[PDB]
Structure formats: structure tokens, C-alpha cells
Design a protein around this nucleic acid. Sequence first.
RNA 1: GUAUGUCUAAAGUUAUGCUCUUAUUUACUAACAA
RNA 2: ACGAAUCUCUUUGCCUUUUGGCUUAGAUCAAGUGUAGUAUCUGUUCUUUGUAACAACUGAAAUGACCUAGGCUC
Lengths: 69, 201, 83
Amino acid sequence: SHRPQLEARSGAKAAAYTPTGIEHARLLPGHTTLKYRKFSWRKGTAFGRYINDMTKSEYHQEFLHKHVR
Amino acid sequence: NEIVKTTTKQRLDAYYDLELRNSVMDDILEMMPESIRQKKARTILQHLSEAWRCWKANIPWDVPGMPAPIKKIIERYIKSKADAWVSAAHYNRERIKRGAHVEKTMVKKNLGRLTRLWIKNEQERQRQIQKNGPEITPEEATTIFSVMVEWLESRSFSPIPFPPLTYKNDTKILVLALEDLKDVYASKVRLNASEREELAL
Amino acid sequence: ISYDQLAKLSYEKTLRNLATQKVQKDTKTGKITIADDDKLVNKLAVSLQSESKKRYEARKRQMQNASFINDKNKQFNEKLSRE
RNA sequence: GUAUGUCUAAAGUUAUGCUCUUAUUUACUAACAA
RNA sequence: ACGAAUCUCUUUGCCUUUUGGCUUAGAUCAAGUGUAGUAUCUGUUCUUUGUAACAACUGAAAUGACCUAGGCUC
């Protein structure tokens, strides 16, 4: 029905094709010239005294915490 | 007739994914020593697709009959893809916060992605909780219990019974809940199946 | 079994099928007319057709042997079941 | 109702178990009516 | 019995019509009628499930080839 890509449109045919002679927008001459190189109260409480996983990054969990409620 | 279209925001994803599956397919062919046919690559790439979906779900993708190297490779490639996805999502959400030009469709997509991401995160946390016990130290729990007990002790707080047939309020109470529920449905005239069922109840 | 072995083994077979029962060059044109027995080439043609025919009928029998919906699925489940 | 897609739009190229009769359902469809 | 050929089957090998992308699982799951068509239903009844032998002939018609309308042959 509608199918994955396997054998790409090979520019062999586009080479043997005739020229168009259209003038595209970007092929207008931009940067003509090249550059070059040189060369009491506190007692009474109950309690008185990196990973390479995008789904487990500290940034990530934090982000999720931020952006859910 | 050498049209070739550039990538743009609109067709970026499709192009990405085709490039990905081409890469993966290439890698697998390189690996595979028999020099199998393109039709046997269809099985491979389809396999990959399923794997991706499984990752999206957070259901582990453990197909038995594979060779380990293939399983490795696909795991890698979906991690790459996954990385691309998650980071993209994050970028989008900052973008949305900023209040930038963003596609209504794109914002919905981002919402979806971020939800799936959230669910994945969440159930991973559940797994973590399971895998190495509850965060609460039992001593802490005990302390908490002692505290709460002490509190109600101080209050003479008689607990709430299981509600029998005794109440003069029972009917009244029921009427409140129903009213509350009805409040959802009075506005929206077109209703879902679940909604309809609820209404009927 | 690799296609290396299966070639040589099939080579060995058709040699048993054989075991059952001049060069002239115009170097200016490059045309190497190997005038050989026209009866033997005909015997190749008939034998090779017969070999392909035998194989063709072999599938036909195996196709007529028998959790699915259509022709393809039945076979696709058979591709799963063989594993 | 449309995209869209087919169709037509005229001139003759020199060879010797069943048939039947009906009534009912359900489904789908319907720029047809309500 | 060994060698070979032909045929059938069985075991394996070969997959021999044997899953051909991506997205927010791409998204959302209904309140209909009569009129017509189409199919599908089900019932419904009945129906029904010239030939041989004997006796006889082996062949017709056309116009043209011989002889003097007639007579045989092809």
C-alpha cells in the first residue's frame, strides 16, 4: 500500500537528464569571493537532633517534576 | 525533473526516520554473514520498528529468536533515536514556555511525547521502589505512627465507622456526590460512551 | 550448508546424471567457432528442461499438502511454526 | 457536495438436494425525503 | 547380493505467494428515521430427485471422347 524506502533515487538518472535552465533563489551568487589562509522548643519534634541515560539524567527527572504540576 | 526537496520542519521527522532505518539496515547487512536478501531485511527493519514502539511503551523488547548482536545493535539505534526524541521534546517545552511560534499540531505532539516520557519515568520509579524497598525507613514509619497515635490520643477522636443503614443523612450524602458528578455533565451535551454510562448510573 | 557446498554437491549429482548414459578461430574477427555435436546440445536442452520440470512439479505436490485467514497467512504461520 | 479518475466525440491502409411462491431481519449504501 | 536407472513415500537442507515506512498507539469512538436499492437472513409451500435378424442391389448424374436420333466403353 504505502512502503518504506530501500533503493534511493540515484542521481544517475538526474545526470543523464537534460538541464532545466531555471534560476533558483539561492544559486544567485552569494559570497562571490573566497577567503584564504596565511599560507527547648526544637526538642519536642518527632525528629529532634553523571549517567548516560536520557531517562535517568538529574536534569531530566527534575524537568519532568517541574513540567507536570 | 531533479526536484529534490529539502528538509523542512514539516518533513523533518519522516526524513530522519528513513535515514535511521537505512543506517540500521546497512549495519545489519554488514553484520549478517550469509548476504541475505532485501526481503529478509524487511523482517529486520519491521523488527526494529516494533522495538521502537516497545521502548515508547516501556515494555522491554525481548524477542527470543534473535542473535544477540542484532539485539544489541537495535538497542543502540533506538537509544540514539530515543535520545533525539527526548531532547527534542525538552527543547519544544522550553520553546512553548517562551511563547514562540509553534505549530498547534506540534504542541499536541510535544504534549503526547512528554506524557509518554512522564509515564515511562513514573513506572521506572515504581520499578525502582520495588527493586530496592520503600524509601521510608521502618524506624521512621514507626515514629510517624507514634506521632499520629499520640495526636488522636490527645484529641479523643472517635474514628469514622463503616457506614451502616442507620443514617438520616445517607440519602442527603448520596445526593451531594451525584450532584457533583452531574456538574461535569450539565455543560457538555455531546458525551462519550463512558460518560453516557456514568450518566445512566 | 553453504552455497559453496550445495553447488559442488549439485555438480556431483548432475555428473551422475551424465554418468547414466573442435576449435576454429578467425583472430581478425575474434570469432571462436566451436563446432560441436548438435545432438548433444539437444540432449542437454531436453535434460535441462526435464530437470526444471521435475523441480517445478515437486513444488506443485508440496503446495498441495494442505490458525490463519488467507493463503499467505497460512504459510506465514507455517514460517513461524518451523522455528 | 465534492476533490479526482475513466468514457464518448466518425470516417474505412491495397493479403488469399433443488425449482418455486412469498413475508421478516439485519447490514451497507444513498446530495433521495423527513 | 553388489552397480546402476525409474517410481513412491519419510527425515533433514532450502523457505520455495512466507507482514515493505514515520508521526500525538497519527487522532476520535455515535442519537437517528422512511423510502429505495442491494446483499444477507430466516421461515414458507409445492414439485420432482426406435433396435435387431432375414430376402435384394453396390451406386447415380453431367457433358465430351468411338461407330452409323440409336448402340457399348471411359
